[PDB]
């Protein structure tokens, strides 16, 4: 609650990244709040054998380097997507690179995959997994890893392969980021043919980790599921019916475990304070766009591919809209920026309360209910 006093200050006066680094730093030293209450079993959700204690996680780009996993999750989230990571560390584009307009509760960013690199982040998650093994409050929480290419890498597959070999065995799922606007030509790989080759290589590389073991599978996968990481793809709102039916076909043929919808958009033009700035736009103004993209991709894939919702989710209603559109689970980013800690507690009660008034035995009853 006290942090919500701090927030309205950090938003008025302080740069975003400085506020970001402070929040990560508070969590590094375990001085963030904890939600220790039972989540409604009536709101759990799943994607194949991934069982989510609740339908809300933290989107990629929040804990890029996995230095703050414990404390953020202990805040009341069921899972977190770290990354996007690249094989070697990158500083990203030139600072300043994140801007926020409170009036529209929106953000624009051109970070450019700044991270300390796979090797160092993997060591951070190894440490986390050892703490998770000992703490019940973290015992059922899922950690996925978002992976992308270095800015100057020519072949994306080569970057994706390296990450899997090094970190694949500690992740519960892998998110393929082909949708960042701030990496040049990165959304050209969303093309159907290259995407197929990428996908099938990701799934194949994961499959090879199993085969060359002398140990059991309990000991191979040092993660919550103690299982092979799933393979998800983060699609961009910057697609088109054609290219959305191109990709949908690839997804159907390659048996992708799920698709994350969506990344930021480069199509919001009515924000006065962000005019002439570069980067992708996040937040509420992306909500309706993202929801429409869920409907299309949920429809184009005949409901066979689970959808992970992302984009402008702030309230319980917003989440239910994503869920009723076809999403199984939701990810938050901007909501945490503008609402802070309460975000998880608040959105979970709103969703539970709304499920009660609108008549649902459980959450799965609501998935895709607009269709
Ligand atoms: C500052 C910032 C950094 C982000 N970094 C990443 C990233 O590294 N990898 C990724 O896949 N998505 C990244 N995203 C996209 C978000 O995860 C999410 O898809 C999008 O911002 C929608 O979130 P919203 O709920 O705030 O609207 C980033 C977004 C922002 C605002
Ligand atoms: C106000 N605020 N601005 C943010 C921002 O710009 N980003 C990035 C552009 C992506 N991320 C976050 C969130 C993870 C921090 C921002 C927050 C929440 C916030 C809460 C509390 C404090 C503290 F004072 F308790 F430490 C703080 F410093 C910041
Ligand atoms: O997927 C992504 C990545 C970035 C970034 O790291 O710059 N930014 C976004 O808006 N989306």
Curated annotation (Swiss-Prot):
Its cofactor is FMN. Its EC number is 1.3.5.2. The active site is at 180 (nucleophile). Pathway: Pyrimidine metabolism; UMP biosynthesis via de novo pathway; orotate from (S)-dihydroorotate (quinone route): step 1/1. The lineage of its organism: Eukaryota, Sar, Alveolata, Apicomplexa, Aconoidasida. One of its GO terms (molecular function) is dihydroorotate dehydrogenase (quinone) activity. It comes from the Eukaryota. It catalyses: (S)-dihydroorotate + a quinone = orotate + a quinol. Binds 1 FMN per subunit. FMN binds at residues 60-64, 84, 177, 234, 282-283, 310-312, 333-334. Monomer. This is Dihydroorotate dehydrogenase (quinone), mitochondrial. Belongs to the dihydroorotate dehydrogenase family. Type 2 subfamily. It is a single-pass membrane protein. Keywords: Flavoprotein, FMN, Membrane, Mitochondrion, Mitochondrion inner membrane, Oxidoreductase, Pyrimidine biosynthesis, Transit peptide, Transmembrane, Transmembrane helix. One of its GO terms (cellular component) is mitochondrial inner membrane. It is found in: Mitochondrion inner membrane. Catalyzes the conversion of dihydroorotate to orotate with quinone as electron acceptor. Substrate binds at residues 64, 109-113, 177, 182, 263-264. Its main location: mitochondrion. One of its GO terms (biological process) is 'de novo' UMP biosynthetic process. The chain holds residues 166 to 566 of 569 of the full protein.
């Amino acid at each position: 609650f006290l942090y919500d006093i701090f927030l309205k200050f950090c938003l008025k006066y302080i740069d975003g990244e400085i506020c970001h680094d402070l929040f990560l730093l508070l969590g590094k030293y375990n001085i963030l709040p904890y939600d220790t209450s039972n989540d409604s079993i009536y709101a759990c959700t799943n994607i194949k054998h991934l069982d989510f204690i609740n339908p809300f996680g933290v989107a990629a780009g929040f804990d890029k380097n996995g230095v703050c996993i414990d404390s953020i999750l202990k805040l009341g989230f069921s899972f977190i997507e770290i990354g996007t990571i690249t094989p070697r560390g990158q500083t990203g584009n030139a600072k300043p690179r994140i801007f926020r307009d409170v009036e529209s509760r929106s953000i624009i960013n051109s970070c450019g995959f700044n991270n300390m690199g796979c090797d160092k982040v993997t060591e951070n998650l190894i440490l986390f997994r050892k703490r998770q093994e000992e703490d019940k409050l973290l015992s059922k929480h899922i950690v996925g890893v978002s992976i992308g290419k270095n800015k100057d890498t020519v072949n994306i597959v080569d970057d994706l392969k390296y990450c899997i070999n090094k970190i694949g065995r500690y992740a519960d799922y892998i998110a393929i980021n082909v949708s960042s606007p701030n990496t040049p030509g990165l959304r050209d790989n969303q093309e159907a043919g290259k995407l197929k080759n990428i996908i099938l290589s990701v799934k194949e590389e994961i499959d090879n980790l199993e085969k060359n073991n002398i140990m059991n599978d309990e000991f191979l996968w040092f993660n919550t599921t103690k299982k092979k990481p799933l393979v998800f793809v983060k699609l961009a709102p910057d697609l088109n019916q054609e290219q959305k039916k191109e990709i949908a076909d690839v997804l159907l043929e390659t048996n992708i475990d799920g698709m994350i919808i969506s990344n930021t958009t480069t199509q919001i033009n009515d924000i006065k304070s962000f005019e002439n700035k570069k980067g992708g736009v996040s937040g509420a103004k992306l909500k309706d766009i993202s929801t429409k993209f869920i409907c299309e991709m949920y429809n184009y894939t005949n409901k066979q591919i689970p959808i992970i919702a992302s984009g402008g989710i702030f309230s319980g209603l917003d989440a239910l809209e994503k869920i009723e559109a076809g999403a199984s689970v939701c990810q938050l980013y901007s909501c945490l920026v503008f609402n802070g800690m309460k975000s998880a507690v608040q959105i979970k009660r709103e969703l539970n309360h709304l499920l009660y008034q609108r008549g649902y035995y459980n959450l799965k009853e609501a998935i895709g209910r607009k269709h």
